[PDB]
Amino acid sequence: VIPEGYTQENVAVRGKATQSAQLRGEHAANSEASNAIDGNRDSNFYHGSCTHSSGQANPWWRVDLLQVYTITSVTITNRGDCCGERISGAEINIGQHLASNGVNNPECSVIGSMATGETKTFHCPAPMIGRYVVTYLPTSESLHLCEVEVNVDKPAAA
């Protein structure tokens, strides 16, 4: 992706994030859904820039972009201090409307697996129209995202 004449922008920092259920207890303060769109890829969960679900099965995290965009890819930063294997199987769904918390929207990509602390771009089959981007983890693992960037192409500046 990223053709001549165009520039790419992360429109996720313009939105509002939320998740199925936040991690409770001792580290609950470092777990806010908003952490995945604060413009910081720091993957050390203890620095406070990563989200963390409750631990209950099939968690999801979502960002409402506030308006519809044509999205080319989504760049994810996996947790780095530990537990990089938990995100395996995660699905990135993108849609104009919220079809069951975004969990049932069209799929951009599936995260096979990512090394601990890895930042990787997942390109959608074709550009997708959507206002909501959801990361659904259909397993018994905790979902922790250190950054979710939603990439939109724009004609370049100058």
Ligand SMILES: C[C@@H]1O[C@@H](O)[C@@H](O)[C@H](O)[C@@H]1O
């Ligand atoms: C915030 C915590 O980080 C590590 O201690 C993990 O083993 C826990 O399951 C939890 O994710």
Ligand SMILES: [Ca+2]
């Ligand atoms: Ca972050």
Ligand SMILES: [Cl-]
């Ligand atoms: Cl905000």
